[PDB]
Amino acid sequence: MYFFSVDPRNGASSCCCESISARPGEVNGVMVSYAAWSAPLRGHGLTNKTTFEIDGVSVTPPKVSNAFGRTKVGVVFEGTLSDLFPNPEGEQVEYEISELNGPSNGVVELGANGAFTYTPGALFTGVDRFWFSINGNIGEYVISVDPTTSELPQPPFTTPVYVPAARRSVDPRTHVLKFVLGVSPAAIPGDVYRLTVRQVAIDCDGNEFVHISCYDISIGSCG
Amino acid sequence: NTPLQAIGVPVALYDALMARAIDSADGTPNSKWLVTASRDLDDGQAKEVKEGI
Amino acid sequence: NLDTLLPLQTIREHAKCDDNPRVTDDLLKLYREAAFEAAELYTGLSFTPEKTIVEPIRLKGRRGKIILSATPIAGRPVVFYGGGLGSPLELIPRPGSNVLFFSQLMATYVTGRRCENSVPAGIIIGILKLIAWNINNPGDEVMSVRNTLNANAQGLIGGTNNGAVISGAQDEWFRYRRVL
Amino acid sequence: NLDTLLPLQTIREHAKCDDNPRVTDDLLKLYREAAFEAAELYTGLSFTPEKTIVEPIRLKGRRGKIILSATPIAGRPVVFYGGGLGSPLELIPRPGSNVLFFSQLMATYVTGRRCENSVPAGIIIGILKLIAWNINNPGDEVMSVRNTLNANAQGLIGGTNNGAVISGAQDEWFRYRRVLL
Amino acid sequence: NLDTLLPLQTIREHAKCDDNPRVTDDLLKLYREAAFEAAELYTGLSFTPEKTIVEPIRLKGRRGKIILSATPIAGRPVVFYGGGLGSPLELIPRPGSNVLFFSQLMATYVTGRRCENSVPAGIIIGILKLIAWNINNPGDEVMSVRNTLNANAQGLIGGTNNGAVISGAQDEWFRYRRV
Amino acid sequence: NLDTLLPLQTIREHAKCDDNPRVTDDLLKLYREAAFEAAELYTGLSFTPEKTIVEPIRLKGRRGKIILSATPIAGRPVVFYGGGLGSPLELIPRPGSNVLFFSQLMATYVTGRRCENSVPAGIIIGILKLIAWNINNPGDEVMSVRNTLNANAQGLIGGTNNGAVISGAQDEWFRYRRVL
């Protein structure tokens, strides 16, 4: 769990954005204490109007592509895992399905040669993903199982670093902001992303006091 | 109009004093004769001096 | 980072180690890296300019005195939030002091001096002195000042053989030290 | 800013170090500036000209008493406001003393000496003595009267003469400090 | 492990003894080992590796105060067995101290320290001083101040050629002690 | 055998008698034997692998208290027999303490330090000092060092003219002896 104190904007107290290390696969929690800034502005404290944005400052584009499939309920789904690794050089393809990032409501039998069978769990209809690792390079494969009726839509292929939609909160009694920071298993070591948060205060009459800060997510390996 | 109006101070004082007494009853070492030797006595007989006293 | 606060040439020019280099520069910067762990471990103060701090306070002293762990600047009102309190309060402190009056009750303010902050030169003259005393007291020479008057008890040569007190440091860092 | 009210030339002329290249200008500045507040904190006198103050007040004693923190001024009314007052009230302090009599009670006034021709020679003499001790007496050996190096067979006497304010510096400044009562 | 804490070069350059073969490397290793065994024994910072222990506990008071010979390692359950129990109980100690709060009763904790680093400059200074004492101050010729001699008709001054206290360390470590 | 524990070369190197001998070698052997039999019985820590002890004990301390002569071993069980016990009792002692809690009543165990690399460094250092003191003090000079203040009524010269006291020795290997 990370805990940051904000600069209080007093004309007072190596890069700009304070630093965050992250490891591929973890999902942590971040706490930000706006007490030093919003306590003097005697009003009604923070509000639930935070806004997040993710941006990359060094990305190291992925090698293996991700892919998408669909199936109806109960029926076994097939696919390949070989046209997703356009390799520049000549090498063999040690396909691997990490048990740590396997499916969640089914099973997968990796074939001998970029083949795999996803038998969906009986009586289940939703989206289900799993993360293959073609020669050290990781990508995600997302499968959506339909309730046999029409068709399901297409989920958005989770990014390397993200903040979940709605797990944020603010304690106006203690001026503390909580949110989640989850890192995909495909995030590449050495990269750096930049997260900027825009939090609004409020006066006793209901006007607005804005505050902007940034944090640099440095995707490291081994913590 | 009850006596309990004007006895808060003494009853609190009594409680405090009795708590002090209870505490100090167990917590003050009940030993006497704080004996002391010097750094020249070969512990191996300072055991023997203790067993003597 | 330290050598930005205390350049090595200033150390050397103070302690006369110039045109007569005693222990080499490496030992000199080790001495420096230990003389900032006696100072600012003896004072309590830290290394950051004009901080603003957040801390939980307590209300021992039933009447209601508050004891802060810093010295709020003159004029800037400190604010109390959290705990039983409708809205952050505004108390203006007493100049050069940390005693105040009237679910964890917290307080925030701005410490230090408003202007530039080096390291209050004056808690550096001890550090220079503590370095100096350590250049010509490597630890084989018996020097020992007396604290008590009477005696040891046995034929012991008194004692305060410490350094940083025999050097004039403790009594030059003390001006930034609270006496409670 | 210590350049105009203590010229480095006067220091170099006092401690007779005008030919020492081992005391550079930056080192002498560090001494001069660490001794203009290690013996100003000690006397609790700001050195800038008349400098307004505002601070809270807490009455003490049943007959009323207001202890200030500056010995404000000679002949200019200190005024009180806030704290249940319906109109700012003006008191006149008595010279040298900092005690007065009759939603926190505030007070404002102006301490300091009128002109920029700042701290009298008393203060400066102390600094000159303190600097001189600091430049040619580092803390590395315990001394004794005159400047001899004794033995004592027992603990040295050097409780203080290592680097403390042995020079008449500290005591000169005191002539200006104020014993309470 | 010590060879990374104090490199013999730093010693030989502090004590200004590098040109005289009388202070060899085996004897200076002995000195550098006897200066770390009394650094973690007057300050209690456990520079010794692991040393698992199994001792018998004698539960002392009615508040239930368990005392330990050597401190545990701050975060590893101290397990109690026997003495009537039929299901060993695990407690977590408080970091720094050796007090706990609950056919005999036994306990088997673990002691020492694992990681290499985290040795502060304060300690080393004390250790350099202590060795610098012993390399040129053996047990003969009880000296007096400013390393002088004496003929004090009554007796002599005593406790002068004991190290670690006449020179530095005892006082250069106190900044790491408490109540 | 001690030459494994402490070789004469380290002695002659510590006492600064490498170059000038100041004593032949057999004298140095005798001094070393004395110095290893002084610290040994001064701190109560043996050096030989064991010594299986058989000792008759007497119950005292109505709570039931057993005092042993040696210091158990460290981790073995001590066994009591005779006394009236139907079977040998078996207790486990506290490391480094000869205190146990329960037609004669005997007890047997083993005293410890069965290794060689366990005399940590201290007892070695002090012994070096005590040797160093004996090398130049054949007993010709007076060299009496004062203890507590009041000059004895008889009007003598004082007390404590004691090798391995007035040298470093005690203060050196005392960090091991317990205080109770």
Side-chain angles (χ1 to χ4, degrees), chain C residues 109-128:
Chain C
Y109 44 95
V110 53
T111 77
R113 125 259 353 230
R114 127 97 157 216
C115 233
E116 52 82 25
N117 174 86
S118 43
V119 50
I123 178 174
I124 205 161
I125 310 288
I127 277 179
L128 298 190

PDB file of all heavy atoms in Angstrom, chain C residues 109-128:
ATOM      1  N   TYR C 109       0.663  22.472   9.909  1.00  0.00           N
ATOM      2  CA  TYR C 109       1.153  23.845   9.898  1.00  0.00           C
ATOM      3  C   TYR C 109       2.415  23.906   9.054  1.00  0.00           C
ATOM      4  O   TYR C 109       2.743  22.961   8.329  1.00  0.00           O
ATOM      5  CB  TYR C 109       1.403  24.349  11.318  1.00  0.00           C
ATOM      6  CG  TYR C 109       2.104  23.360  12.208  1.00  0.00           C
ATOM      7  CD1 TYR C 109       3.473  23.396  12.369  1.00  0.00           C
ATOM      8  CD2 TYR C 109       1.395  22.404  12.901  1.00  0.00           C
ATOM      9  CE1 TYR C 109       4.110  22.503  13.184  1.00  0.00           C
ATOM     10  CE2 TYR C 109       2.024  21.508  13.710  1.00  0.00           C
ATOM     11  CZ  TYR C 109       3.377  21.562  13.849  1.00  0.00           C
ATOM     12  OH  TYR C 109       3.997  20.658  14.669  1.00  0.00           O
ATOM     13  N   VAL C 110       3.128  25.023   9.148  1.00  0.00           N
ATOM     14  CA  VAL C 110       4.370  25.238   8.419  1.00  0.00           C
ATOM     15  C   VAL C 110       5.472  25.563   9.416  1.00  0.00           C
ATOM     16  O   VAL C 110       5.340  26.495  10.215  1.00  0.00           O
ATOM     17  CB  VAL C 110       4.233  26.345   7.367  1.00  0.00           C
ATOM     18  CG1 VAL C 110       3.684  27.588   7.989  1.00  0.00           C
ATOM     19  CG2 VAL C 110       5.579  26.646   6.778  1.00  0.00           C
ATOM     20  N   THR C 111       6.542  24.782   9.387  1.00  0.00           N
ATOM     21  CA  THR C 111       7.638  24.925  10.327  1.00  0.00           C
ATOM     22  C   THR C 111       8.756  25.757   9.710  1.00  0.00           C
ATOM     23  O   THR C 111       8.566  26.458   8.715  1.00  0.00           O
ATOM     24  CB  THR C 111       8.159  23.558  10.741  1.00  0.00           C
ATOM     25  OG1 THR C 111       8.970  23.030   9.689  1.00  0.00           O
ATOM     26  CG2 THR C 111       7.007  22.626  10.968  1.00  0.00           C
ATOM     27  N   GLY C 112       9.941  25.686  10.311  1.00  0.00           N
ATOM     28  CA  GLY C 112      11.132  26.317   9.785  1.00  0.00           C
ATOM     29  C   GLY C 112      11.011  27.829   9.737  1.00  0.00           C
ATOM     30  O   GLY C 112      10.125  28.436  10.322  1.00  0.00           O
ATOM     31  N   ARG C 113      11.938  28.426   8.997  1.00  0.00           N
ATOM     32  CA  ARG C 113      11.903  29.858   8.811  1.00  0.00           C
ATOM     33  C   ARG C 113      11.437  30.046   7.395  1.00  0.00           C
ATOM     34  O   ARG C 113      11.749  29.231   6.527  1.00  0.00           O
ATOM     35  CB  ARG C 113      13.280  30.464   9.013  1.00  0.00           C
ATOM     36  CG  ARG C 113      13.783  31.299   7.849  1.00  0.00           C
ATOM     37  CD  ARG C 113      14.774  30.519   7.004  1.00  0.00           C
ATOM     38  NE  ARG C 113      15.130  29.235   7.604  1.00  0.00           N
ATOM     39  CZ  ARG C 113      16.379  28.808   7.766  1.00  0.00           C
ATOM     40  NH1 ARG C 113      17.395  29.560   7.372  1.00  0.00           N
ATOM     41  NH2 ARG C 113      16.614  27.631   8.323  1.00  0.00           N
ATOM     42  N   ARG C 114      10.689  31.107   7.138  1.00  0.00           N
ATOM     43  CA  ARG C 114      10.114  31.290   5.811  1.00  0.00           C
ATOM     44  C   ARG C 114      11.143  31.334   4.702  1.00  0.00           C
ATOM     45  O   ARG C 114      10.885  30.851   3.600  1.00  0.00           O
ATOM     46  CB  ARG C 114       9.275  32.571   5.786  1.00  0.00           C
ATOM     47  CG  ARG C 114       9.629  33.543   4.673  1.00  0.00           C
ATOM     48  CD  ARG C 114       8.709  33.368   3.477  1.00  0.00           C
ATOM     49  NE  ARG C 114       8.648  34.575   2.662  1.00  0.00           N
ATOM     50  CZ  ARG C 114       7.553  35.002   2.043  1.00  0.00           C
ATOM     51  NH1 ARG C 114       6.422  34.319   2.145  1.00  0.00           N
ATOM     52  NH2 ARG C 114       7.589  36.112   1.318  1.00  0.00           N
ATOM     53  N   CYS C 115      12.312  31.885   4.972  1.00  0.00           N
ATOM     54  CA  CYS C 115      13.278  32.058   3.895  1.00  0.00           C
ATOM     55  C   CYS C 115      14.095  30.838   3.566  1.00  0.00           C
ATOM     56  O   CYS C 115      13.735  29.721   3.924  1.00  0.00           O
ATOM     57  CB  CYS C 115      14.236  33.200   4.235  1.00  0.00           C
ATOM     58  SG  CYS C 115      14.361  34.454   2.943  1.00  0.00           S
ATOM     59  N   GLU C 116      15.195  31.059   2.866  1.00  0.00           N
ATOM     60  CA  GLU C 116      16.096  29.974   2.515  1.00  0.00           C
ATOM     61  C   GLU C 116      16.526  29.211   3.763  1.00  0.00           C
ATOM     62  O   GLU C 116      16.658  29.777   4.852  1.00  0.00           O
ATOM     63  CB  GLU C 116      17.319  30.525   1.782  1.00  0.00           C
ATOM     64  CG  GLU C 116      18.017  31.661   2.512  1.00  0.00           C
ATOM     65  CD  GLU C 116      18.956  31.173   3.597  1.00  0.00           C
ATOM     66  OE1 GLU C 116      19.436  30.025   3.491  1.00  0.00           O
ATOM     67  OE2 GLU C 116      19.191  31.921   4.569  1.00  0.00           O
ATOM     68  N   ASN C 117      16.739  27.910   3.599  1.00  0.00           N
ATOM     69  CA  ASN C 117      17.187  27.031   4.674  1.00  0.00           C
ATOM     70  C   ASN C 117      18.439  26.295   4.234  1.00  0.00           C
ATOM     71  O   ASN C 117      18.364  25.385   3.402  1.00  0.00           O
ATOM     72  CB  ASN C 117      16.098  26.031   5.056  1.00  0.00           C
ATOM     73  CG  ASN C 117      16.582  25.000   6.061  1.00  0.00           C
ATOM     74  OD1 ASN C 117      16.542  25.228   7.268  1.00  0.00           O
ATOM     75  ND2 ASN C 117      17.042  23.856   5.561  1.00  0.00           N
ATOM     76  N   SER C 118      19.540  26.594   4.892  1.00  0.00           N
ATOM     77  CA  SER C 118      20.728  25.829   4.647  1.00  0.00           C
ATOM     78  C   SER C 118      20.633  24.781   5.731  1.00  0.00           C
ATOM     79  O   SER C 118      19.816  23.865   5.627  1.00  0.00           O
ATOM     80  CB  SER C 118      21.954  26.693   4.838  1.00  0.00           C
ATOM     81  OG  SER C 118      21.822  27.501   5.996  1.00  0.00           O
ATOM     82  N   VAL C 119      21.439  24.905   6.780  1.00  0.00           N
ATOM     83  CA  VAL C 119      21.343  24.009   7.926  1.00  0.00           C
ATOM     84  C   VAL C 119      21.734  24.924   9.054  1.00  0.00           C
ATOM     85  O   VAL C 119      22.737  24.717   9.718  1.00  0.00           O
ATOM     86  CB  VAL C 119      22.237  22.767   7.798  1.00  0.00           C
ATOM     87  CG1 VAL C 119      23.661  23.139   7.415  1.00  0.00           C
ATOM     88  CG2 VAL C 119      22.176  21.905   9.050  1.00  0.00           C
ATOM     89  N   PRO C 120      20.919  25.942   9.297  1.00  0.00           N
ATOM     90  CA  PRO C 120      21.262  26.943  10.295  1.00  0.00           C
ATOM     91  C   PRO C 120      22.736  26.987  10.639  1.00  0.00           C
ATOM     92  O   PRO C 120      23.104  26.455  11.686  1.00  0.00           O
ATOM     93  CB  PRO C 120      20.459  26.451  11.495  1.00  0.00           C
ATOM     94  CG  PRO C 120      19.265  25.749  10.882  1.00  0.00           C
ATOM     95  CD  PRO C 120      19.490  25.640   9.391  1.00  0.00           C
ATOM     96  N   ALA C 121      23.579  27.619   9.819  1.00  0.00           N
ATOM     97  CA  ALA C 121      24.983  27.565  10.192  1.00  0.00           C
ATOM     98  C   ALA C 121      25.141  28.046  11.614  1.00  0.00           C
ATOM     99  O   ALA C 121      24.793  29.183  11.942  1.00  0.00           O
ATOM    100  CB  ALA C 121      25.827  28.408   9.245  1.00  0.00           C
ATOM    101  N   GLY C 122      25.665  27.176  12.453  1.00  0.00           N
ATOM    102  CA  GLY C 122      25.681  27.399  13.874  1.00  0.00           C
ATOM    103  C   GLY C 122      25.353  26.089  14.536  1.00  0.00           C
ATOM    104  O   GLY C 122      25.877  25.796  15.610  1.00  0.00           O
ATOM    105  N   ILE C 123      24.490  25.285  13.918  1.00  0.00           N
ATOM    106  CA  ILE C 123      24.628  23.853  14.110  1.00  0.00           C
ATOM    107  C   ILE C 123      25.401  23.353  12.901  1.00  0.00           C
ATOM    108  O   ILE C 123      24.936  22.496  12.145  1.00  0.00           O
ATOM    109  CB  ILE C 123      23.242  23.192  14.257  1.00  0.00           C
ATOM    110  CG1 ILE C 123      23.318  21.674  14.409  1.00  0.00           C
ATOM    111  CG2 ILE C 123      22.318  23.595  13.120  1.00  0.00           C
ATOM    112  CD1 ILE C 123      21.973  21.057  14.692  1.00  0.00           C
ATOM    113  N   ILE C 124      26.613  23.860  12.731  1.00  0.00           N
ATOM    114  CA  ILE C 124      27.560  23.258  11.810  1.00  0.00           C
ATOM    115  C   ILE C 124      28.935  23.430  12.427  1.00  0.00           C
ATOM    116  O   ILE C 124      29.860  22.661  12.151  1.00  0.00           O
ATOM    117  CB  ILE C 124      27.454  23.891  10.414  1.00  0.00           C
ATOM    118  CG1 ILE C 124      27.939  22.921   9.348  1.00  0.00           C
ATOM    119  CG2 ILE C 124      28.242  25.177  10.343  1.00  0.00           C
ATOM    120  CD1 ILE C 124      27.464  23.281   7.981  1.00  0.00           C
ATOM    121  N   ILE C 125      29.060  24.435  13.295  1.00  0.00           N
ATOM    122  CA  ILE C 125      30.343  24.705  13.924  1.00  0.00           C
ATOM    123  C   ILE C 125      30.696  23.577  14.865  1.00  0.00           C
ATOM    124  O   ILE C 125      31.874  23.254  15.049  1.00  0.00           O
ATOM    125  CB  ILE C 125      30.315  26.063  14.641  1.00  0.00           C
ATOM    126  CG1 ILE C 125      29.775  27.132  13.707  1.00  0.00           C
ATOM    127  CG2 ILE C 125      31.695  26.456  15.071  1.00  0.00           C
ATOM    128  CD1 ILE C 125      30.731  27.481  12.627  1.00  0.00           C
ATOM    129  N   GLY C 126      29.692  22.936  15.454  1.00  0.00           N
ATOM    130  CA  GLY C 126      29.960  21.715  16.181  1.00  0.00           C
ATOM    131  C   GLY C 126      30.388  20.597  15.254  1.00  0.00           C
ATOM    132  O   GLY C 126      31.340  19.868  15.548  1.00  0.00           O
ATOM    133  N   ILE C 127      29.715  20.463  14.111  1.00  0.00           N
ATOM    134  CA  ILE C 127      30.082  19.410  13.178  1.00  0.00           C
ATOM    135  C   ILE C 127      31.511  19.608  12.708  1.00  0.00           C
ATOM    136  O   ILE C 127      32.302  18.661  12.674  1.00  0.00           O
ATOM    137  CB  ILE C 127      29.097  19.357  12.000  1.00  0.00           C
ATOM    138  CG1 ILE C 127      27.861  18.562  12.378  1.00  0.00           C
ATOM    139  CG2 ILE C 127      29.734  18.703  10.815  1.00  0.00           C
ATOM    140  CD1 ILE C 127      26.852  18.491  11.277  1.00  0.00           C
ATOM    141  N   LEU C 128      31.877  20.842  12.366  1.00  0.00           N
ATOM    142  CA  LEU C 128      33.276  21.128  12.076  1.00  0.00           C
ATOM    143  C   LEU C 128      34.158  20.794  13.270  1.00  0.00           C
ATOM    144  O   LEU C 128      35.234  20.205  13.115  1.00  0.00           O
ATOM    145  CB  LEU C 128      33.441  22.591  11.687  1.00  0.00           C
ATOM    146  CG  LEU C 128      32.691  22.992  10.430  1.00  0.00           C
ATOM    147  CD1 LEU C 128      33.112  24.372  10.005  1.00  0.00           C
ATOM    148  CD2 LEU C 128      32.985  21.996   9.347  1.00  0.00           C
TER     149      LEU C 128
END
